[PDB]
Write a protein that binds this ligand. Sequence first.
Ligand SMILES: [Mg+2]
Ligand SMILES: [Mg+2]
Ligand SMILES: [Mg+2]
Ligand SMILES: [Mg+2]
Ligand SMILES: [Mg+2]
Ligand SMILES: [Mg+2]
Ligand SMILES: [Mg+2]
Lengths: 124, 155, 189, 252
Amino acid sequence: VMREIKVNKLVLNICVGESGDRLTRAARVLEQLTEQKPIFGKCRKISCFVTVRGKKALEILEKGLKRRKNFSDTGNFGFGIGMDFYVHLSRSGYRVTRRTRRRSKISKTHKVTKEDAMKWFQTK
Amino acid sequence: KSRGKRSGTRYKFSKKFRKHGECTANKYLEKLNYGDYVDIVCDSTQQKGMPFNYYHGKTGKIFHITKRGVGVLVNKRVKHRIEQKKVCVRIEHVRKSRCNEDFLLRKIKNAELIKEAKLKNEHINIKRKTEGPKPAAMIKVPPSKIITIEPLPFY
Amino acid sequence: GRRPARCYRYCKNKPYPKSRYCRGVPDPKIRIYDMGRKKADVNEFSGVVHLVSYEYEQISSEALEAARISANKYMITNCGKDNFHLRVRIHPFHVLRINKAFGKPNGVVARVDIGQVLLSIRTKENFVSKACEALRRAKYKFPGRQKVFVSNKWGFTPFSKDEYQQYKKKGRIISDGVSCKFIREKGPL
Amino acid sequence: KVVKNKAYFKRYQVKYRRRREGKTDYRARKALILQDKNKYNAQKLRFVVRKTNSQVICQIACAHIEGDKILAEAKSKELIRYGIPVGLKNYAAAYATGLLCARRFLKSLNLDTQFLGVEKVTRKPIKAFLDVGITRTTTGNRVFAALKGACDGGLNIPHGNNRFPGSFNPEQLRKNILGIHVAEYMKTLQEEDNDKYKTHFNDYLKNNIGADDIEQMYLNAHEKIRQNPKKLNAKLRKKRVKEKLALYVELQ
RNA sequence: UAGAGGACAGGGCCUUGACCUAUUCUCAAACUCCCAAUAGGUAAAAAGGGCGAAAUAACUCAAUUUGU
RNA sequence: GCAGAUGUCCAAAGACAAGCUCAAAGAGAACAGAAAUCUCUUGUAGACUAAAAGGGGAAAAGCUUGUUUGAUUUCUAUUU
RNA sequence: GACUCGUUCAUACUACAGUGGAUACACCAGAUCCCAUCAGAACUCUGAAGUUAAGCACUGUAAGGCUUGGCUAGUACUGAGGUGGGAGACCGCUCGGGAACACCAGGUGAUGAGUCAG
Ligand SMILES: [Mg+2]
Ligand SMILES: [Mg+2]
Ligand SMILES: [Mg+2]
Ligand SMILES: [Mg+2]
Ligand SMILES: [Mg+2]
Ligand SMILES: [Mg+2]
Ligand SMILES: [Mg+2]
């Protein structure tokens, strides 16, 4: 009931070269796709990305869709197109990990896993 | 050649194993007065107020208290003569010494004893009697429970 | 090529190993350490002779190597190549130095104690005499007073023979190669 | 490699309990607590405000070597008694709670007549310092409402005005403490998406608290406040272990 | 320093490895979970200490007396 | 004696607060590979902290961000 | 039964399980307003439809760790003594002090102030 397996966060990702206006173009494209302002990723400025939640994210995923492998051991997954989509799945109460106050660890049985993720995918 | 303010301190000021972190927030509530004896135990997690290498472990009378400081009169042996050194420290390093409190407890107990004595007029000997020789006793041991001993052969 | 070895006999100087504060130090001559059927099981070899130094001395790497060689060749000559296992249970870390001011590094030495062992052979209970002989031969190539010393143990494993047998009988002791691990009734299931 | 080795565990220094739990700062806390060591016997009262999910908790705490000592304490769920039901995490509610706590403290002291403080909404005062503890202080925070409430009561809580809503805009602050923002929101909800509105302010609806009345209710509440405040040992474990082994044997 | 037990890279299910897991041999002046002996420091009461009152202060406190 | 370092560098690499967690490893995701960026899990610091080496440092002392000039004037008690 | 501030800062940790939620914590519902971002994820604000699934609490595990104890061991080392031994290296004795790792056994918390519910 609370152990449903929502999509926590979808992250569209465009790695491109080294910021020669192509990056700007990519960013623009991303913006057009999804109503978020994009954010830039730095050298260790090479790449753009956007994080999306909720209905919008779901919609994006659905359109994006147009493998056993491309799921992680931790029960996320991704796929590519030019873009890379990475979907990060969770259950309710994921907040306990990430809040400021009494931040804690999620139990193993409540982490999503590969099989569960696969099942979820099959369902939607 | 190299006598800097933190030399020979690889271990003096190293925080002990599984006691890194910082000074606990309850250590700042230790009440100090002009006359309290006080250990100086350099918590090197605070770098302000770090008293010199030598005063680590050495106790002293508090002669001055400040916002977050404590001046401590500590003796230093200097060749031919001990001298008073006014070590100005933060509170993080100064810990309240316990020697004085042993004495204090004894004093308290002694007062009570004195009062009791007076109640009845008796010559009670207060002063701590040191470990003298043991008095005569007659120790019952069964012959069953007396395990005879010989030296051991070599192996 | 080298010094007498009476030069570097006693353990004056603190230990002084290959590290950040040494660098340009040549390799030990001894590289092999253990030889002859090193891969044997624990149950194979019961007989175990030690060669114990009764001396706080140093022992050149070269000397050690020589001793090892002596042990091996003799064993080969006498019993089979795969009827024994000769551990050298001491390693040369402390480096020596030479002047020609502070010395520059020159050879490594394997400092020892009054209690501890140099060489250990582990062979079948038949060939223990041969092993003993080998060890005594080797001894002629260390400095100081060593003593060949046949052990009550099973073979590098720290149990007496009888004890080991008992353990085997009630299955409390897993054999690896050489080492054996003793089950303690401790972990999870 | 497995990161969580035996070795790792051996090494591992456990945090302080509270820090591990995730409740106290310690860095902040020590600063808050220690006052000048030449001011001996000066207690230093901290005003703790906690914003729990469905309450606010306002305590006056003292600090001692053995443990803290709470002098006065008010939780937002007392406000039911004072004629304010529902909206207990509300900025207004927080303010009220703060005020209540202050009042309680004053009563405890036996010093309520001298310190009236700001009568209604716009000797040296008894001093205390805000322990916001862990919630970040953004402008328009709810702890600041509580602080304001306390101030309006007796307490000198030294504060800058940067963190009251819209900052310094006093009108906004006033609105917030009345509940007027909440009322506005309610009105807006009513205007568009009525089902949603119904779903949302369910408790309020049940109470029969319309928009207009909320401010009045809050005022009344304020007035009221002003007026008056099991384990198994070794053997058992061994037995258990034995039993499991037996069962395993049986299975085999 | 050795094997033992395991689940990524090359050749024609096997071998060579590296990597994990539990072991094992031996080590440190410029390594340390731990840690002696010896050496060191302070304390063991009358110019003082107790438990009290009343004064004094421009300090301190919310408290002409909250304490110092 | 041994292993080294110093004659500097810094309007931030100073000050304060806020937020955040680092190395590494793993499993993933178009081009993308042993390496790009992204995501998650594990992560007592194995990173980083101007420059030796050593101490210290995890809601920080690190990283990012905001605001600044206390890198200010005067004087003591002092420590080395 | 729960909560807030704490104290000691692993007997308090971690991993994998099991059990529990009247009130409470929590997750969870939403974005007008203060606020906060790439992102209402966080932070903030306003909620109360659900849920113990996680957090939290509690208990388990021939659990790892941690911690008391024994045992290692009067072993190692050592202060003082020696016209003692030994060619030396080093090793006994006399008066004293005296470890560590490992191993084995037990334990896995205790608690100050205040509040809340019945
Ligand atoms: Mg010659
Ligand atoms: Mg020398
Ligand atoms: Mg050793
Ligand atoms: Mg050493
Ligand atoms: Mg900070
Ligand atoms: Mg449950
Ligand atoms: Mg255990």
